[PDB]
């Protein structure tokens, strides 16, 4: 331990050791609504456990889902009805039979499983979920006791009670938004809230019970994933909906006017007017960002890791006067920056956050992302426009990054290939290793696996080699999204070939 | 500049900007001895300038050479005769004509040399280099004046005078090494040195003049490379030869005994071992004068090159030391090297440096840590990537940005030759990772994998661009004969390599290395 002197006996064994936090891996993007089954939509029953087995058999160690919130009427998990609740339509009816909350003969006749129609699924399943929730509350055994534990839990009630009351009042009143509610409900006068509890007690207890059932079923999926070596990566939009408990029960955390209407709403310039209310970050700074801390605590309860959509909003955000009809007349505002993430980590511990950072982004975004150690994204479908500086080209990938073939907002690789621009196609053929065009999804999968990016994620549609009809979402259309389901005859038992082929790629590129 | 407040008007223009220090690039490994021409060996004349034009036409921005020192009798640039001098056999005779130091009709008749024979080259060129050097010293114009500037320059003379005297004494005395010299020469008694100057003055002045001529020609190549957008990457072995001015004129900087013989010599352990037999540095001693010897060595490397690789870089963190009596390497111990304090001293003395770490083989965690602490890139070599498993660091998916990727180096066979003798297990593995067409084009498959890497710098040997087989291998380690001789085929001019240039350029454009 001194210049010129002898080193100890075993110097040549002092070899470099790979950092375990740098381990290369792969995963599949599959939302549970796409699982097969008889009730109009996928669920957290037997298909979720079979998927986990299949995924593990491939050597993948990550399962990514879309947000698990209650979606809008079109099915969108990004315009959810609450930021912290689970989508009750994902509750398995068959799992309720095993709990004794339904009996086998109460299960409905199967319906055709081509695509999720959310109206059909709700009509079919909700009466029975309600019925099961009713039996749960009227019992007084182990299960009822676990409901009480759930309900009385401080880290459940800080979002659950607000969510239940909001939903009771929305049920009782015929109003567009809570801005049109009568004043003592609009502004949460204590006695009105007690009058809501009394007059809507049964709806409130059932809402809570249903959230318990979702939690139960999701936590068993998550425990089985952990046993099989699978991390689950969730998703959350940066902004929440105006008509929600999140805003209604925390008005001072948002930029509302004295009458509770948003002064400013979200979007991006030339433009796109998303119309979500905006956070009062200065205000949140006061109480050490407790709202956002809570949101992450719940994300952590649901997921091992979590992507945040429009992450750039944490450094700077586009703000449009709520009167406006289009986005072009806004200004950029300063975001909370790292101090937000300091507060989170102090409140909840070490977090694994993924930054959605697509499109044009400014230097503060990159700097913020890097300062908290969060990986960004590369999407191979975006790599062949422009020149060789395109950051989605594999030679421009980074280690701390998630590479996708595409996301739920893109066509499948097959579909994209079919409509691809001639200029972009010839470029793609130079860079990728392409055999037959039927196998084009595997060419792209292989490029993703061959990247230096630490994490490679592939949508289930591309593993199945499906075309445009299996596209999950097309942005800026309002109908025909969120509907894709795995073809009814394609069981996980019948996907050994695909599993073996993935495993071979993972092994070749050091992702096992 | 406050949370919730407005950003200025032009926020969306505050876009990320590529750091120029991160620019991806490519280059060719070609030693100047390999250039074509009539005088038995390549030189710093017309072919060096034509190569630079060709290289620039490919879009490459780096030229890597082997060390430019006076080689051993076998031609090895790694067992050189001096660490700081240039190989005078690289001097272009035709460039001397343009200086007026030779006249046109004094140029010799062409000879055939499909490969460098060093003895033939020396016999043909040296009389004329000597003659030019003589005319230089007998003149008294601009050129003579530039020689004086060169000679009197403090950063030349700290190595040049020692190098000239050493060589004069070696010339005059019939001795194996300087260890067998008579005592006052061995130990550099001042009066003996003055007696050497007076009795060997002509040899000393001509030695200095020849070093001036090499410097002149090398600096003209280096200026033309700079004008065409080409950086030149040199090479330096970590250790120097015992029989040299480097050791003789600096004994206190090496681990010698009282009679000036090495106590310990270089090598590496088993995996008997490898006994290189070079003398070792007295790092604690060098610490005392702030590593002035190494600072000077780098100052000279900087004068010759934009960037420099250092062979056996691991030696700076730990080195294998064998008792000089020994017949094999197995009976040594590992010793602690200077670490970053050496590089602190360098940077303080010479400024910002661009060093490449040769870091091949088994290396310890202190090596990686040292390399990373000074920001030096290491190496990946694609020919080593297909043994073992998917954690092999030479596989492209395990490459790093701050790294130099090669197809192979001068110590490896060409890609074609390597492919021919490749193990069946390794070949099938290679065919799964690489994109291979016909075996005649295997060098381009490997070139393309190199260019596709995230490594910032990709370097290809000229032999692989020409798609040549094992006969064009530059060096085979642990053979002593038939190395260093490769030359570009006499009929393959740079004018005839537009197809290859276009094909390289297309790969560089596809992978963002232009």
Author numbering:
A (entry chain A): 59 to 328, 335 to 576
B (entry chain B): 59 to 329, 334 to 576
What's the publication's text?
Because only glucose and maltose are exportable to the cytosol, further enzymatic activity is required to prevent the build-up of maltotriose in the chloroplast. This role is fulfilled by disproportionating enzyme 1 (DPE1),4 which is the plant plastidial isoform of 4-α-glucanotransferase (EC 2.4.1.25) that is found in all kingdoms of life, although it is referred to as amylomaltase in bacteria. AtDPE1 forms a homodimer with a deep, long, and open-ended active site canyon contained within each subunit.
Each protomer contains the canonical (βα)8 barrel fold expected at the core of a GH77 family enzyme. Ser-60 is the first residue that can be clearly resolved in the electron density, and the ensuing segment up to and including Glu-79 forms an extended arm that embraces the opposing subunit in the homodimer and makes a significant contribution to the dimer interface; the buried surface area totals some 2,000 Å2, as calculated by PISA (available on the PDBePISA Web site). In the LF structure, the central portion of the gate is disordered. In all cases, when the acceptor site is vacant, the end of the gate is disordered.
